[PDB]
Design a protein around this ligand. Sequence first.
Ligand code: HEM
Ligand SMILES: O=C(O)[C@H](Cc1ccccc1)NC(=O)[C@@H]1CCCCN1C(=O)CCC1CCCC1
Length: 454
Amino acid sequence: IKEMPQPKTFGELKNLPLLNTDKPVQALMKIADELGEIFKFEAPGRVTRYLSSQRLIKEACDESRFDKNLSQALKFVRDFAGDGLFTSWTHEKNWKKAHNILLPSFSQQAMKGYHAMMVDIAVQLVQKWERLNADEHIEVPEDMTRLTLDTIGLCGFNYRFNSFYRDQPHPFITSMVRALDEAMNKLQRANPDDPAYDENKRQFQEDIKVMNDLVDKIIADRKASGEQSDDLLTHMLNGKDPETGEPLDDENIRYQIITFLIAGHETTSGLLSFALYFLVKNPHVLQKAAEEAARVLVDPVPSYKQVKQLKYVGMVLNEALRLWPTAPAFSLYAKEDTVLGGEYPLEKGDELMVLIPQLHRDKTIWGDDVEEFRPERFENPSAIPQHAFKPFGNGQRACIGQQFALHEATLVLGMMLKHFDFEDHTNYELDIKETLTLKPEGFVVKAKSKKIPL
Ligand code: HEM
Ligand SMILES: O=C(O)[C@H](Cc1ccccc1)NC(=O)[C@@H]1CCCCN1C(=O)CCC1CCCC1
């Protein structure tokens, strides 16, 4: 049994000031590069261990030994996402109840029903870019966020954010973004009770009220109209858990909708932004993906079956998730006393953090060339060792949105590659901004139309 490395300390604050940065994931990645597959991290009243190797993470992903933990970040997000799926413990009644009711709404089969709505938003993006003048550029993560927010709004609850009609966000999104910022900002605070944070606290309660008031209204309005539109809100108002025989209540429905709007704004847009980043930095790869898009997408409007045929586009998206998993960490706790990797003894309740970008850089799995962008790593799914590739987390607490995110992203990237050539006109230097998620800040391109009608 070995003694675990630990990064540099700050007296009574232990390791906490290491999170005093706007790029804490990138900081934890550097520490893992220096210390290796496991390190201890201590704050006043808190210990966790950061895992980076497939060897240890495959053990952490054993659901008989470890369950999902709410990290401090998830506990602060729970002040507005409540006992929605993402911020509930596995043992809370509302977790399994919502999971049973919603799984069918998120299946690959259910994507056939969402396809038309996703095409509506995708075509708005392509039209935007077609309509730019020769001297203008594309603000990539800004546009991808407009698309992914609007898609979840229309598939989630038949609501149009109309993000392509606006520079300034919807009132709901102003409060959601500012609540998410406060939740992440509170991680690093040594003295959170200091009156310097009274205004932050006041503003946070106001933003929770805005989100609650606006979603509660959408739900009340739907119940009144009796309208049976094919969206997540209808499924949640009509669904019954086969286990309990119970439907979700209106409060839990509101938490699910806030949770989906977080995910729709934060995660899929990062994936699309990194994918386009890697393609413009790897023009041989962009040509392979552009050739597939041109060959497969033969109709003005892509069909569900055509999106399923975009294999190489799917490989580009998986290789973007390998290098920059846009939801880059999850947390586990030990169900019982156990020994991790024959070396590290854990007590019941001990917590683990999985650093997904480091897992995805494990040379024992991927080979020496782990920094190269090579979609061919994913030519064959079954060749990927179990628990090597975890951009959607683990087991029964894995992302319910995975099929949705990949269908949207494959559709969008396919249409972008059909309709435009791209130029990295500024020779962009990757700058990764961290919120809940990772995005390439300031990433801009020029698009030259191939002038193919919709
Ligand atoms: C609209 C798109 C998406 C929706 C609606 C969505 C929704 C969710 C929900 C509800 C959960 C909690 C599932 C549960 O525990 O029962 C979850 C977990 C997760 N999602 Fe997503 N998601 C989306 C996109 C993505 C994307 C694109 C990624 C990564 C690139 C991602 C990564 C994850 C991860 C890593 C977890 C596990 C979190 C943990 O263990 O703490 N999600 N998602
Ligand atoms: O939130 C936590 O408990 C710890 C940070 C922490 C460690 C020790 C003391 C206080 C905070 N979080 C993390 O290590 C990670 C990596 C750095 C940024 C914050 N982290 C997060 O998990 C943020 C939650 C996100 C939800 C989807 C993807 C991740």
